[PDB]
Design a protein around this ligand. Structure first.
Ligand SMILES: COC(=O)[C@@H](N)Cn1cc(Br)c(=O)[nH]c1=O
Length: 330
């Protein structure tokens, strides 16, 4: 089997991407944030505290003939940006772009933090990291991908995020028309439950390539590119007027600037992020100070190849018994 679904930026800055997902019988379609950095599939629901729902589409398990309460199961998660959610668990039929999984754990939110409430466009998350990170207790549950894997033509999914444009998540096959040149594969460590890999280095603009190992995770659920302070300092030094602002919470730059590109290494291959991808606009409405798309990972504890990096590439998440990651230009 295979599946193929379009993923769409939630706003003009590509702050996140939503993908339609069919849940239950008859189908209830929710727009979920596919997140390769976590492993819970959770949704706004009829059980969510009413004051914490503001425009989202909710899942109503009582209206699904295939929904079953997973007795005694609860979940609770907190993300890297400080947001959180929690609730109980159903199993139900879940389909993504024509690919169907029966008995998928659908985690129903009873509580969500303010940032989820305030984002009307995101109806929940669909985690695509390794199932070892799943927070369901007392019986850990599998991700949609892990459940589908045995049925897929090939045990892979691919992320093809667009810049200011729609893109695609495919399951079970590699679309050889979706990228240029070849796909370069690189080793993955699953020791922390992430799609963790080691970049071979970087370049700023037309500058010389610096060979240096940068361990980080491929994370579709994170907007920005978070890298070591040395690397990030080297990037923003090439932008006149750029500076790190503690009050804003990272590097900002004059909106009149032209940003240089940023290149990262995948083995001997190179992925180039155009400068425009690194612009996240005025820090507040009307401001001439703009927020940068490359930020320091110093306060995070891990380097994160988020959407800023990933949308410059066609990315293969290979879930073979020894998982690997593939990157191609596009
Ligand atoms: C809800 O999405 C957002 O607020 C975006 N800023 C993407 N995002 C979402 C989560 Br959860 C996170 O830990 N980091 C992040 O960049």
């Amino acid at each position: 089997s295979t599946g193929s679904a379009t993923t769409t930026p939630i706003d003009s800055l590509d702050d996140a991407y939503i993908t339609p997902v069919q849940i239950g019988t008859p189908a209830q379609t929710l727009n979920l944030d596919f997140d390769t950095g976590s492993s819970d599939l959770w949704v706004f629901s009829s059980e969510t505290t009413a004051s914490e729902v503001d425009g989202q589409t909710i899942y109503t398990p009582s209206k699904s003939t295939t929904a079953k309460l997973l007795s005694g199961a609860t979940w609770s998660i907190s993300y890297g940006d400080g947001s959180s959610s929690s609730g109980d668990v159903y199993t139900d039929t879940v389909s993504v772009g024509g690919l169907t999984v029966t008995g998928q754990a659908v985690e129903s939110a009873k509580k969500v933090s303010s940032s989820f409430t305030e984002d009307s466009t995101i109806d929940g998350l669909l985690g695509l990291a390794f199932s070892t990170l799943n927070t369901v207790s007392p019986t850990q549950q599998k991700t949609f991908f892990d459940n589908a894997k045995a049925s897929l033509d090939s045990p892979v999914f691919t992320a093809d995020l667009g810049y200011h444009a729609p893109g695609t998540y495919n399951f079970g096959f590699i679309d050889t028309t979706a990228y240029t040149g070849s796909i370069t594969y690189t080793a993955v460590s699953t020791k922390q439950g992430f799609w963790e890999w080691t970049s071979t280095g970087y370049a700023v603009g037309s500058g010389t390539f610096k060979s240096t190992s940068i361990d980080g995770i491929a994370d579709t659920g994170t907007t920005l590119l978070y890298l070591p302070a040395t690397v990030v300092s080297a990037y923003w030094a090439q932008v006149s007027g750029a500076k790190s602002s503690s009050s804003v919470g990272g590097y900002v730059f004059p909106c009149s600037a032209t940003l240089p590109s940023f290149t990262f290494g995948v083995g001997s291959a190179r992925i180039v992020i155009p400068g425009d991808y690194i612009d996240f606009g005025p820090i507040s409405t009307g401001s001439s100070s703009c927020f940068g798309g490359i930020q320091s990972s110093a306060g995070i504890g891990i380097n994160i190849f988020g959407d800023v990096a990933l949308k410059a590439a066609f990315v293969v998440f290979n879930g073979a018994t020894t998982p690997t990651l593939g990157f191609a230009s596009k």
